[PDB]
Design a protein around this ligand. Structure first.
Ligand SMILES: [Cl-]
Ligand SMILES: [Cl-]
Ligand SMILES: [Cl-]
Ligand SMILES: [K+]
Ligand SMILES: [Mg+2]
Ligand SMILES: [Mg+2]
Ligand SMILES: [Mg+2]
Ligand SMILES: [Mg+2]
Ligand SMILES: [Mg+2]
Ligand SMILES: [Mg+2]
Ligand SMILES: [Mg+2]
Ligand SMILES: [Mg+2]
Ligand SMILES: [Mg+2]
Ligand SMILES: [Mg+2]
Ligand SMILES: [Mg+2]
Ligand SMILES: [Mg+2]
Ligand SMILES: [Mg+2]
Ligand SMILES: [Mg+2]
Ligand SMILES: [Mg+2]
Ligand SMILES: [Mg+2]
Ligand SMILES: [Mg+2]
Ligand SMILES: [Mg+2]
Ligand SMILES: [Mg+2]
Ligand SMILES: [Mg+2]
Ligand code: NA
Ligand code: NA
Ligand code: NA
Ligand code: NA
Ligand code: NA
Ligand code: NA
Ligand code: NA
Ligand code: NA
Ligand code: NA
Ligand code: NA
Ligand code: NA
Ligand SMILES: [Sr+2]
Ligand SMILES: [Sr+2]
Ligand SMILES: [Sr+2]
Ligand SMILES: [Sr+2]
Ligand SMILES: [Sr+2]
Ligand SMILES: [Sr+2]
Ligand SMILES: [Sr+2]
Ligand SMILES: [Sr+2]
Ligand SMILES: [Sr+2]
Ligand SMILES: [Sr+2]
Lengths: 237, 119, 46, 194
RNA sequence: GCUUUACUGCAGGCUGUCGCUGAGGACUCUCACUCCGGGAGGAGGACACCGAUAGCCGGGCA
RNA sequence: ACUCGUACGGUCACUGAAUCCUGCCCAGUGCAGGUAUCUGAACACCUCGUACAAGAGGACGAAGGACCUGUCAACGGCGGG
RNA sequence: GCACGGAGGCGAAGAACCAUGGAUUUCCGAAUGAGAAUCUCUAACAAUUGCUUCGCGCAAUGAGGAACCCCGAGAACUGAAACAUCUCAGUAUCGGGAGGAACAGAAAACGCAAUGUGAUGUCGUUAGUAACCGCGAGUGAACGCGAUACAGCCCAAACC
């Protein structure tokens, strides 16, 4: 047959690319030698096209002006700190080791110094649970207990823009506008609605997959469609 | 470095090259890794020098053990070009051998002894 | 359109080639410009 | 008596034992960080180099080249093929890696001509060979009784036509009798069946 | 052209084994190699990646 | 490529606004998990064979299968007496 | 000049014409200072190399050529009265490269087994033989022999 849409994606052609030339900045934590003698002032709150959430522009002591992944409750004028000795307040960054247990955090690094990988989406947060000299235990937004190096840096508080998901798009046109700001091909044509040549589910008088949807993990690209390695399906049981 | 099992003091290395310099003006000396090698094999060698800045190391890796199973004493020189200069060459020399000193036997003897001690 | 200096030289040459076979060449050879082109009926290169 | 050279030779008969073993373990760390073709002042295996024609003289160059290990890196058929011509994974190329190495080296030094080459080991993902190249335009060589032959016009780009020792072996030209019915005088003249 | 529990194969995924690969049926370590870090250094570690091969799945493809 | 993205994410599918609802079936097929025992290739190992080799057999046994379990808003099914 | 016009001119200061050698030889073009649909902008071996007086100072490469030649990549229609091994075929086509011819070449050969031959191409033959093969269709040498032409040498190491 013909390659399915999932396969066209990988080629990274314009249709499937993200509007990167329009994206603002990479919100990675600052790199500090040590001492925490790094503080800056929030000079402005901006809209981040890539995340549909707000970001804050900060002017640091040493003259560096950079955008930062802002938690909820940060405003212009406010002073932020980044370092081992940073103060324990919303909007401040410091290694998990310095963070008191039971404190919601965001933009958590996976490997100390990577700039932040976890909990960066609208209104989300990781929950610092356990401390130690060898391992910091964090509860990520998905509910998973993640063991991290206590040297992994993070920002106190939850990500701004929470609740974004609580309101329905209502119109196709609204989805449309959001989609234009992401690396995604939209709208979506169902596999069952295509010709046999275009998808495993295509073909047949009436629409219906002519096979079970739960596909094996070992299936090759082009065939891995539907419910991938489902451990179960439905709502029952 | 892989064939070097002990470090020689700058001062000892100094005396050796001096001895080697008078050895060529008085007695006899071999210049070059090949000639140095045949001397040890023919047993016609009293003291063999081996530079430490030799690349590739294969060129002189054999001198150490070969000398041991031949009783011939050997010493290391930090630089290749010094040994060549001391041997009286306009170029460098990865290894050298004093084939019978000359009015330096006393010194060459001490040098060999100072090494055995240095292990 | 906007013609470059070179394009212009070529266009000019084509215009010149578009002339007739001199009358004397007729007498001399004792009896056509096979490359006669028309701006409308034809199409030049570029 | 034994030449000092024989000791380098003897060391390389078992590159995985003795001092040579530790040298390779050390060196390869540096080699893995070098480029595809690195010129070197002196051969790593002197005995082999001199044996292959090397000389400490102007116009003689040595370069270490690395190539990825394994079989062919081929793309599966996009058009119809019978089971036989659908193979992709176990199909290997007809030129050995040493030959690929000789060619890359010669491309890097367009003016030089490949004289010979030899192996200097490998790790799990690549192989290294050192190639001896000669400057056919340098007088120190135009006047050398043992190398001036490589200055002739018909020796130009010799490696690309399989005129190298590795080239000739790979073309099945070693045997002078049985087995060389389709290799000599050329693979091509024999319909490419060798 | 299309389909599939038609025939025969081919990609691909899973898995064992051999090489890369080191020291002291379960284990410690560091030195290759990998990853994080501007760097110091940190994490991991003879595994993983990669080469070779074996078994299974394999209209994704011929 | 996704991705200047990180689960309030984005990938793969099905249904197709709101409203009231969405029953029964895990035997077969699919997916996933588990698995005492059974089955399960090659290398190495052992026996026989060969002054060697081919080869024959053995022991060990991964995934997989047998077997067990979960799962239908998974393929689908919901009859005759 | 082709080219048989008109006008005019050149040639005994030996023109025309022919051979050999030299002069001139715009721009783009491998195209090489940078750029560009044959032009433009502000001293140029661009790029990769060797040597090196370490300065582009001295040099090399690049692109072309009817096919021939050498090294790589490598189909299908087709035949088998289907078709998968096989065939078509190492063909078509593709990548790289040399020359006037290429390539091969002085035995770790041959094995008419010998008290024998004696580098290598090629031609005739050996022969559709040996060998291969759903042992189907088909594929298919060699040694030798008769010819052509003949030619044999140089390193590495030992010892210096
Ligand atoms: Cl969305
Ligand atoms: Cl060449
Ligand atoms: Cl004979
Ligand atoms: K065929
Ligand atoms: Mg960022
Ligand atoms: Mg878009
Ligand atoms: Mg749809
Ligand atoms: Mg339709
Ligand atoms: Mg239709
Ligand atoms: Mg399909
Ligand atoms: Mg339907
Ligand atoms: Mg006009
Ligand atoms: Mg000579
Ligand atoms: Mg020929
Ligand atoms: Mg990296
Ligand atoms: Mg098909
Ligand atoms: Mg519908
Ligand atoms: Mg509809
Ligand atoms: Mg130009
Ligand atoms: Mg047929
Ligand atoms: Mg064939
Ligand atoms: Mg038949
Ligand atoms: Mg054939
Ligand atoms: Mg024969
Ligand atoms: Na026109
Ligand atoms: Na070259
Ligand atoms: Na063959
Ligand atoms: Na069922
Ligand atoms: Na001219
Ligand atoms: Na040039
Ligand atoms: Na220069
Ligand atoms: Na037929
Ligand atoms: Na047919
Ligand atoms: Na066959
Ligand atoms: Na006869
Ligand atoms: Sr990042
Ligand atoms: Sr970064
Ligand atoms: Sr269908
Ligand atoms: Sr239910
Ligand atoms: Sr030198
Ligand atoms: Sr018109
Ligand atoms: Sr060339
Ligand atoms: Sr509804
Ligand atoms: Sr079931
Ligand atoms: Sr002859």
């Amino acid at each position: 047959g013909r390659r399915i849409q999932g396969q066209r994606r990988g080629r990274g052609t314009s249709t499937f690319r993200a509007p990167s030339h329009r994206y603002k900045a990479d919100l990675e934590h600052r790199k500090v030698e040590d001492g925490d003698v790094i503080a800056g002032t929030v000079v402005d709150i901006e809209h981040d096209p890539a995340r549909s959430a707000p970001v804050a522009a900060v002017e640091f002591e040493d003259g560096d002006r950079r955008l930062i992944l802002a938690p909820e409750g940060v405003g212009v004028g406010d002073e932020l700190q980044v370092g081992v000795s940073a103060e324990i307040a919303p909007g401040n960054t410091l290694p998990l080791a310095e963070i008191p247990e039971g404190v919601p955090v965001c933009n958590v690094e996976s490997s100390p110094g990577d700039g932040g990988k976890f909990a960066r989406a609208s209104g989300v947060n990781a929950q610092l649970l356990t401390h130690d000299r060898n391992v910091a235990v964090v509860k990520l937004p998905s509910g998973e207990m993640k063991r991290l190096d206590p040297q992994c840096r993070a920002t106190i508080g939850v990500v701004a823009g929470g609740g974004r998901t609580d309101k329905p798009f209502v119109k196709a046109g609204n989805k449309h506008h959001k989609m234009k700001a992401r690396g995604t091909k939209w709208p979506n044509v169902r596999g069952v609605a295509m010709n046999a040549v275009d998808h495993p589910f295509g073909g047949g008088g009436r629409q219906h997959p002519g096979k079970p949807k739960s596909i094996s993990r070992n299936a090759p690209p082009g065939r891995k469609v539907g419910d991938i390695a489902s451990k179960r399906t439905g709502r029952g049981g | 470095p892989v064939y070097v099992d002990f470090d020689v003091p700058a001062d000892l290395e100094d005396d050796a090259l001096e001895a080697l310099e008078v050895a060529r003006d008085t007695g006899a000396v071999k210049k070059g890794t090949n000639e140095t090698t045949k001397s040890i094999e023919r047993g016609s060698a009293e003291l063999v020098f081996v530079a430490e800045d030799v690349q590739p190391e294969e060129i002189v890796m054999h001198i150490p053990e070969l000398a041991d199973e031949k009783g011939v004493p050997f010493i290391f020189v930090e630089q290749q070009d010094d040994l060549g200069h001391a041997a009286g060459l306009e170029v460098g020399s990865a290894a050298a051998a004093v084939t019978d000193a000359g009015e330096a036997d006393a010194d060459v003897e001490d040098i060999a002894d100072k090494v055995e001690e240095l292990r | 359109g906007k013609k470059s200096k070179a394009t212009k030289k070529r266009l000019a040459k084509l215009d010149n080639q578009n002339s007739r076979v001199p009358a004397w060449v007729m007498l001399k050879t004792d009896r056509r410009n096979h490359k006669r082109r028309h701006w409308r009926r034809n199409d030049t290169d570029e | 008596a034994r030449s000092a050279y024989s000791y380098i030779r003897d060391a390389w008969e078992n590159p995985g034992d003795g001092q040579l073993a530790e040298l390779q373990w050390q060196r390869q760390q540096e080699w893995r960080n070098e480029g595809a073709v690195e010129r070197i002042e002196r051969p790593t295996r002197l005995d082999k180099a001199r044996s292959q024609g090397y000389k400490a003289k102007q116009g003689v160059i040595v370069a270490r080249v690395s190539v990825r290990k394994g079989s062919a890196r081929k793309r599966r058929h996009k058009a119809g093929r019978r089971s036989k011509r659908q193979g992709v994974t176990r199909i290997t190329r007809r030129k050995d890696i040493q030959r690929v190495a000789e060619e890359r080296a010669s491309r890097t030094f367009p003016n030089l001509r490949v004289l010979n080459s030899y192996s200097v080991g490998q790790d799990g993902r690549q192989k290294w060979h050192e190639v001896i190249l000669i400057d056919p335009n340098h007088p120190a060589i135009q006047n050398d009784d043992d190398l001036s032959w490589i200055c002739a016009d018909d020796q130009a780009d010799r490696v690309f036509r399989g005129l190298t020792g590795a080239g000739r072996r790979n073309r099945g030209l070693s045997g002078k009798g049985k087995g060389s019915e389709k290799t000599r005088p050329s693979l091509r003249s024999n319909g490419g069946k060798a």
